[PDB]
C-alpha cells in the first residue's frame, strides 16, 4: 500500500508537470507560476509522506 | 560479439577489480607526491631559468681618479642538481640521513641544492671572460617522504 | 518595427539623428565628421518593457548534438515530419515565468525550431 | 483591515488594493517609441490617422507652434484592466505632473 | 553605462576610452570587437550610452592622457603619463593574454569578449556565474605553494 | 593551429559570429567553424595519449559556441568508464587482463591508455551524461530515461571519503550521524602504525 | 538547486522537474537510499549543522 501510494503520488506530480508544460496551470493570486508549481509539488509530496 | 558484454554479477566483480587496479597503481596520497615531483623538477628549473640575471656596474664616486669606464660583472644561474638527503655532522663528514634518524634526532629531512653559476667579467675595450662555478651550494630543500 | 544604428561612411563613427527645417527632414548625420544621409525609417529609439523575444531564433541549432538534453519521439517536426525532437526550457529572463517547452528538430538538414 | 462594503466584497477590496499599491508607468504599459512627425495631421502611423485628426479638429493650441518630435506609448490592455485605470486619469496625471 | 576598473588606478574609466587607447579610433571597429553579430538590436541599444559618454576622446594619445591622469602618483607634461598609461596597458591589463609588444589586438579581443559577456548577462541570455560552483575553483597543493 | 583553426590576428572581426571560440587556459586563441568534429578529434587524441595527456580538461559549450581547454594545476578529476552507442567500452577481456595483472603487467595506466576510462573533471561534468550503473544502459527505449549516455560510474560508493567509507551501510543512516562518525573515526584508538 | 546547468546531478537530464531529480526520497531508511537521493539527503542534513 505504501509503495502504491508513493507511485501514485509520483504519477500525480508527473501529471502536474505535464499540465504546467501544456499551459494549463492557472497561477494562484499572490504568487507567480514557478511559486504555484513548486507549492503544488511540495504539497503533493508532503501529503504523500 | 555479445560474449564480451559483461553480465550483472560479473559487473560487480569486474568493477571492484577495476577499483582494485586503480588503488594498486595510484595509491591514496598520489596528489602529494605528484605535486612534489612536479615542483622539484619543473618548478625549480623554471625558477632558476626565468630569474633575471644579475647586472653590475661599479660606482667609485667618492674617490679621485675615477675611471670613465668602470669594470662590469654579470651573474647567471642555469642548472640545478639535487642530491639525496644528506646530513653533515659537526666535523663535516656527510652521511645518508634516514627518515627515522631525522625523526629521532629532531633533524630536518632535507636535501642540498646545487646551482651552476656563470660569471662574465667585462671591461670596456677588452674581451669579457667567463668563469664557471659549478655545483654551488645555496641551501637545503625539505623532501616529502615516499 | 524596430530600427538599428548606422555608421559613417567616412570615419566609421556613430551617426546621430538630426533635423533640418528648410526641407523639414530627419537626417542621420555625423558629429565627428561631415557626413549625412537620409533616414529610411522614422524611429530613433524604441524601447519595449515586455518585449516579445523570438527565442526560437536565439536558440542555437547546434544543440541537437547535446547528450544532456532530453529527447522525445511523439511531437513530429512541422517542416520535415521527423519524429525525434529535442525539447528544453528557455534561458532568458522573462521565460522562466511561463513553464514553456521549446522543440528543435533533430534532423541535421532541417533543424526546425518551434513551440507547442 | 477594512470597514463596510470593502470588508465583505472583493471588488471594493480590490479597489482599496489598487489605491494602496504603487503603480508606476512601468507596470502598465507595453512599449515606448520616439518618432519624428513633421505633419501631425498626416502622421507616419496610419493607425493613428483615424483619430489624431479628431483631436486637432478643435485643438486647444496652435498645431504650428508644436515641436515635430513625438513620443508614442502603447499601453497593455490587461494591466489597465487589472489596475482599473482609464486614459483620462493618465492624461490628468501627465497634465498635473508636467 | 559601462565602466572599467584598472589595476593601480583608483578612478573609474569608461571602456570606450580604454578601447581607443589600444589603437582603435573608429566606433565601428570597436563595436566589431564587442558585438559579433550586427543584426542584434538590443545589444546595439545597450552599447549606446558608453559611446555617448566617451565622445570627447577620439584619438589614441588623448585616451592615454586620460588614463595616465587618474593613476596613483600622476606624472607631469602629458607624455610620461602616456608612457605610464602604456605601463598599465601592457604589464597590468591582462598579463595572461600577453605582456610583450604588439599584443593590443588580442587584448582588445579579450576586452571585447568581456564586454560581450557583460551585455549577454545584462539581457539575461546567459546565466550568472556562481561563486561556490566548484568548477571555478583550483586546489593549491604542495607544488605551487 | 595545424589542424583547421584560424588565429585571431589573421581574421576579420565580422567573421566571428558564426564560428566557435576556443579558449586555452583562459586565453582566446581563435575560432573554428566545425566544433563537433574538432571536439570528437580532440577526444580521440586524448583517449589514445598521443599528443594530449589524459589530465587535460576539454569543454564544448554548445549553446554559447565555446570550446575551453584547461591544462593548469589544481583541477580535480574522477575516472569514469566510456559509453558509446549505449554500450560500455569495458569488456570481459579487460577483466581477464586485470586478472593477469594480478599475474603480471596489465596495469591501470594501460587500461586508461586503451581508451576505456577517462578523467572527467568537475567542469566537464556539465557537458557529459553519466550512467549510474550498466543496468541503466539496457533499458528499452519505450520507457528509457535517456538514450544518449556518454559515461558510466564505476561504483557510486567511491563518492565517499576515507573516514566516511568505513561506515557499514551509510545509506541506511541519517546524514548528520555519518558526519559525526567521520568526525569520530579520527579519534578512535588502535595500532596507528606498525 | 540546479548546481549544474539545469541539472542537480550529471546523471539526470536538463530541465527535469520530476521528484527523483528534485530530491524526493521514495525509499525508507530500512530499504536504503539510492546514490542520488543519498547525496540529496546529505545536502539536506548539512543545513541543520
Ligand atoms: Zn563621419
Ligand atoms: Zn525537421
From Swiss-Prot, chain B:
Function: DNA-dependent RNA polymerase catalyzes the transcription of DNA into RNA using the four ribonucleoside triphosphates as substrates. Second largest component of RNA polymerase II which synthesizes mRNA precursors and many functional non-coding RNAs. Proposed to contribute to the polymerase catalytic activity and forms the polymerase active center together with the largest subunit. Pol II is the central component of the basal RNA polymerase II transcription machinery. It is composed of mobile elements that move relative to each other.
Self-association and partners: Component of the RNA polymerase II (Pol II) complex consisting of 12 subunits.
Protein's recorded name: DNA-directed RNA polymerase II subunit RPB2
Signal peptide limits: none
Note, other: The binding of ribonucleoside triphosphate to the RNA polymerase II transcribing complex probably involves a two-step mechanism. The initial binding seems to occur at the entry (E) site and involves a magnesium ion coordinated by three conserved aspartate residues of the two largest RNA Pol II subunits.
Species lineage: Eukaryota, Metazoa, Ecdysozoa, Arthropoda, Hexapoda
Location in the cell: Nucleus
Organism: Drosophila melanogaster
UniProt family annotation: Belongs to the RNA polymerase beta chain family.
Residues of the full protein shown: 13 to 158 of 1176
UniProtKB/Swiss-Prot annotation, chain C:
Zn-finger region bounds: TFIIS-type: 73-115
Pfam families per UniProt: Zn_ribbon_RPB9 (PF02150), Zn_ribbon_TFIIS (PF01096)
Binding site for Zn(2+) 2: 77, 80, 105, 110
Keywords, ordered alphabetically: DNA-directed RNA polymerase, Metal-binding, Nucleus, Transcription, Zinc, Zinc-finger
Signal sequence, start to end: none
Gene3D superfamilies tied to this protein: 2.20.25.10
GO cellular component: nucleolus; nucleus; RNA polymerase II, core complex
Keyword flag Transport: no
Binding site for Zn(2+) 1: 8, 11, 30, 33
A GO molecular-function annotation: nucleic acid binding
Gene Ontology process terms (BP): maintenance of transcriptional fidelity during transcription elongation by RNA polymerase II; mitotic cell cycle; transcription by RNA polymerase II; transcription initiation at RNA polymerase II promoter; transcription-coupled nucleotide-excision repair
Localization, UniProt: Nucleus, Nucleolus
Top-level taxon of origin: Eukaryota
Zn finger limits (C4-type): 8-33
InterPro entries with a match to the protein in the record: DNA-dir_RNA_pol-M_15_CS (IPR019761), Rpa12/Rpb9/Rpc10/TFS (IPR012164), Zn_ribbon_RPB9 (IPR001529), Zn_ribbon_RPB9_C (IPR034012), Znf_TFIIS (IPR001222)
Assembly notes: Component of the RNA polymerase II (Pol II) complex consisting of 12 subunits.
Record function comment: DNA-dependent RNA polymerase catalyzes the transcription of DNA into RNA using the four ribonucleoside triphosphates as substrates. Component of RNA polymerase II which synthesizes mRNA precursors and many functional non-coding RNAs. Pol II is the central component of the basal RNA polymerase II transcription machinery. It is composed of mobile elements that move relative to each other. RPB9 is part of the upper jaw surrounding the central large cleft and thought to grab the incoming DNA template.
Family, as annotated: Belongs to the archaeal RpoM/eukaryotic RPA12/RPB9/RPC11 RNA polymerase family.
Protein name: DNA-directed RNA polymerase II subunit RPB9
UniProt organism field: Drosophila melanogaster
UniProtKB/Swiss-Prot annotation, chain G:
Assembly, per entry: Component of the RNA polymerase II (Pol II) complex consisting of 12 subunits.
Recorded name of the encoding gene: Polr2A
Taxonomic source organism: Drosophila melanogaster (Fruit fly)
Other notes: The binding of ribonucleoside triphosphate to the RNA polymerase II transcribing complex probably involves a two-step mechanism. The initial binding seems to occur at the entry (E) site and involves a magnesium ion temporarily coordinated by three conserved aspartate residues of the two largest RNA Pol II subunits. The ribonucleoside triphosphate is transferred by a rotation to the nucleotide addition (A) site for pairing with the template DNA. The catalytic A site involves three conserved aspartate residues of the RNA Pol II largest subunit which permanently coordinate a second magnesium ion.
Intracellular or extracellular location(s): Nucleus
Function as written in the Swiss-Prot or TrEMBL entry: DNA-dependent RNA polymerase catalyzes the transcription of DNA into RNA using the four ribonucleoside triphosphates as substrates. Largest and catalytic component of RNA polymerase II which synthesizes mRNA precursors and many functional non-coding RNAs. Forms the polymerase active center together with the second largest subunit. Pol II is the central component of the basal RNA polymerase II transcription machinery. It is composed of mobile elements that move relative to each other.
Region feature Bridging helix, mapped onto this chain: 35-47
Post-translational modification: The tandem 7 residues repeats in the C-terminal domain (CTD) can be highly phosphorylated. The phosphorylation activates Pol II. Phosphorylation occurs mainly at residues 'Ser-2' and 'Ser-5' of the heptapeptide repeat. The phosphorylation state is believed to result from the balanced action of site-specific CTD kinases and phosphatase, and a 'CTD code' that specifies the position of Pol II within the transcription cycle has been proposed.
Amino acid at each position: 500500500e505504501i509503495q502504491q501510494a508513493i507511485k501514485k503520488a509520483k504519477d500525480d506530480v508527473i501529471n502536474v508537470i505535464q499540465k504546467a508544460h501544456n499551459m494549463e496551470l492557472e497561477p494562484t493570486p499572490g504568487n507567480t507560476l514557478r511559486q504555484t508549481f513548486e507549492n503544488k509539488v511540495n504539497r503533493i509530496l508532503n501529503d504523500a509522506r | 560479439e555479445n560474449a564480451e558484454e559483461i553480465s550483472h554479477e560479473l559487473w560487480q566483480e569486474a568493477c571492484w577489480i577495476v577499483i582494485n587496479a586503480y588503488f594498486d597503481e595510484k595509491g591514496l596520497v598520489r596528489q602529494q607526491l605528484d605535486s612534489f615531483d612536479e615542483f622539484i623538477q619543473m618548478s625549480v628549473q623554471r625558477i632558476v631559468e626565468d630569474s633575471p640575471a644579475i647586472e653590475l656596474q661599479a660606482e667609485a664616486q667618492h674617490t679621485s681618479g675615477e675611471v670613465e669606464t668602470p669594470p662590469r660583472f654579470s651573474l647567471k644561474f642555469e642548472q640545478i642538481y639535487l642530491s639525496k638527503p644528506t646530513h653533515w655532522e659537526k666535523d663535516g663528514s656527510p652521511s645518508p640521513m634516514m627518515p627515522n634518524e631525522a625523526r629521532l634526532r629532531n633533524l630536518t629531512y632535507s636535501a642540498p641544492l646545487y646551482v651552476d653559476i656563470t660569471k662574465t667579467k667585462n671591461v670596456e675595450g677588452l674581451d669579457p671572460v667567463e668563469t664557471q662555478h659549478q655545483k654551488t651550494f645555496i641551501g637545503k630543500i625539505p623532501i616529502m617522504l615516499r | 518595427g524596430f530600427v538599428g544604428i548606422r555608421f559613417c561612411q567616412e570615419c566609421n563613427n556613430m551617426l546621430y539623428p538630426k533635423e533640418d527645417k528648410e526641407n523639414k527632414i530627419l537626417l542621420y548625420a555625423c558629429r565627428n565628421c561631415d557626413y549625412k544621409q537620409e533616414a529610411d525609417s522614422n524611429c530613433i529609439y524604441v524601447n519595449k518593457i515586455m518585449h516579445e523575444i523570438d527565442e526560437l531564433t536565439h536558440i542555437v541549432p547546434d544543440v541537437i548534438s547535446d547528450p544532456t538534453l532530453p529527447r522525445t519521439e511523439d511531437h513530429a517536426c512541422p517542416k520535415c515530419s521527423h519524429r525525434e525532437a529535442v525539447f528544453f526550457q528557455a534561458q532568458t529572463r522573462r521565460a522562466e515565468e511561463e513553464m514553456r517547452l521549446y522543440y528543435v528538430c533533430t534532423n541535421q538538414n532541417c533543424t526546425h525550431r518551434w513551440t507547442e | 483591515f477594512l470597514t463596510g462594503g470593502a470588508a465583505r466584497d472583493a471588488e471594493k477590496a480590490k479597489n482599496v488594493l489598487c489605491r494602496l499599491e504603487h503603480t508606476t508607468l512601468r507596470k502598465v504599459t507595453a512599449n515606448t517609441a520616439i518618432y519624428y512627425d513633421p505633419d501631425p495631421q498626416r502622421t507616419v502611423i496610419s493607425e493613428d490617422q483615424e483619430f489624431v485628426n479628431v483631436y486637432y479638429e478643435m485643438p486647444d493650441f496652435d498645431p504650428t507652434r508644436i515641436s515635430p518630435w513625438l513620443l508614442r506609448i502603447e499601453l497593455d490592455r490587461k494591466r489597465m484592466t487589472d489596475k482599473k485605470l482609464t486614459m483620462e486619469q493618465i492624461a490628468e496625471k501627465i497634465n498635473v505632473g508636467f | 553605462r559601462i565602466i572599467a576598473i584598472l589595476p593601480y588606478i583608483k578612478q573609474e574609466i569608461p571602456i570606450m576610452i580604454v578601447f581607443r587607447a589600444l589603437g582603435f579610433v573608429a566606433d565601428r571597429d570597436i563595436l566589431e570587437h564587442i558585438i559579433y553579430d550586427f543584426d542584434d538590436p538590443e545589444m546595439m541599444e545597450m552599447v549606446k550610452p558608453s559611446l555617448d559618454e566617451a565622445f570627447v576622446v577620439q584619438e589614441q594619445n588623448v585616451a592615454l592622457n586620460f588614463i595616465g591622469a587618474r593613476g596613483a602618483r600622476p606624472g607631469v607634461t602629458k607624455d610620461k603619463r602616456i608612457k605610464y598609461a602604456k605601463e598599465i596597458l601592457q604589464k597590468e591589463m591582462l598579463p595572461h593574454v600577453g605582456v610583450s609588444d604588439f599584443c593590443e589586438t588580442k587584448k582588445a579581443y579579450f576586452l571585447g569578449y568581456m564586454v560581450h559577456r557583460l551585455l549577454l548577462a545584462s539581457l539575461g541570455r546567459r546565466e550568472l556565474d556562481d561563486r561556490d560552483h566548484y568548477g571555478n575553483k583550483r586546489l593549491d597543493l604542495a607544488g605551487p605553494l | 593551429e595545424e589542424w583547421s583553426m584560424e588565429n585571431l590576428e589573421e581574421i576579420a572581426p565580422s567573421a566571428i559570429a558564426d564560428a566557435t571560440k576556443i579558449f586555452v587556459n583562459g586565453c582566446w586563441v581563435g575560432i573554428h567553424r566545425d566544433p563537433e568534429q574538432l571536439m570528437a578529434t580532440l577526444r580521440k587524441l586524448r583517449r589514445q595519449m598521443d599528443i594530449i595527456v589524459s589530465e587535460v580538461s576539454m569543454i564544448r559549450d554548445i549553446r554559447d559556441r565555446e570550446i575551453r581547454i584547461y591544462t593548469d594545476a589544481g583541477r580535480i578529476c574522477r575516472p569514469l568508464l566510456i559509453v558509446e552507442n549505449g554500450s560500455l567500452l569495458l569488456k570481459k577481456t579487460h577483466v581477464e587482463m586485470l586478472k593477469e595483472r594480478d599475474y603480471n603487467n596489465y596495469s591501470w595506466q594501460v587500461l586508461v591508455a586503451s581508451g576505456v576510462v577517462e578523467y572527467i573533471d568537475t567542469l566537464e561534468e556539465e557537458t557529459v551524461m553519466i550512467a549510474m550503473s550498466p543496468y541503466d544502459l539496457k533499458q528499452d527505449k519505450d520507457y528509457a530515461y535517456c538514450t544518449t549516455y556518454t559515461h558510466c560510474e564505476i561504483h557510486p560508493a567511491m563518492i565517499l571519503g576515507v573516514c566516511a567509507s568505513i561506515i557499514p551501510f551509510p545509506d541506511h543512516n541519517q546524514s548528520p550521524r555519518n558526519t559525526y562518525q567521520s568526525a569520530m573515526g579520527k579519534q578512535a584508538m588502535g595500532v596507528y602504525i606498525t | 538547486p540546479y548546481g549544474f546547468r539545469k541539472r542537480t546531478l550529471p546523471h539526470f537530464i536538463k530541465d527535469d522537474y520530476g521528484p527523483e531529480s528534485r530530491g524526493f526520497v521514495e525509499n525508507s531508511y530500512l530499504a536504503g537510499l539510492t546514490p542520488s537521493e543519498f547525496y540529496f539527503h546529505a545536502m539536506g542534513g548539512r543545513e541543520g549543522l
